[PDB]
Amino acid sequence: MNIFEMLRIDEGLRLKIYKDTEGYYTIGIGHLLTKSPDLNAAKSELDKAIGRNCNGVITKDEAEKLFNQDVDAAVRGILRNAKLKPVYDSLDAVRRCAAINQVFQMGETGVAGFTNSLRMLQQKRWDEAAVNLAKSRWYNQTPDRAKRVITTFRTGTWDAYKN
Numbered sequence: 001m002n003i004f005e006m007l008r009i010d011e012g013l014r015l016k017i018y019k020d021t022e023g024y025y026t027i028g029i030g031h032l033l034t035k036s037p038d039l040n041a042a043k044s045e046l047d048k049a050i051g052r053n054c055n056g057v058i059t060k061d062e063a064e065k066l067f068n069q070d071v072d073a074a075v076r077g078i079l080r081n082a083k084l085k086p087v088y089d090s091l092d093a094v095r096r097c098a099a100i101n102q103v104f105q106m107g108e109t110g111v112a113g114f115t116n117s118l119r120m121l122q123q124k125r126w127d128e129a130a131v132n133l134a135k136s137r138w139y140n141q142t143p144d145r146a147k148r149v150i151t152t153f154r155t156g157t158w159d160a161y162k163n
């Protein structure tokens, strides 16, 4: 297991524009196109992203390309973030994948806020961190996924994905 395989399990692969768990237009491997309810605004974002007129459909290769960029951006975002970087840098590599997954799904606004969970993770109070993480809209909206990512944080193992 690695972060791509992890996110690919969590995000799926769809080649046609679809609405994600939040109702937002998305393609590929959880590549969010827009929060606009306008399908055309999503289609314009898709075409901008891919550099061609996709008419709401892309290839597997184009999906993996966006995905590569999205993962890379998630990491680079964490490393740019004063609240996140010290925590992420304190983690072993399996728990770092958990962090990337969370930021991929939620965005770095979305989690830089998780102050208590961040402190606990930094402290390596894994069971406590895991309890705190689940106390969230995140967990309640996507519990099956959040359970897997929390287990990754709690154990620093790939047990929740292995599978």
Ligand SMILES: CCCc1ccccc1O
Pocket: 078, 084, 085, 087, 088, 098, 099, 100, 102, 103, 111, 114, 117, 118, 121
């Ligand atoms: C509760 C935050 C878990 C986390 C730690 C470090 C970087 C990104 C993360 O989402």
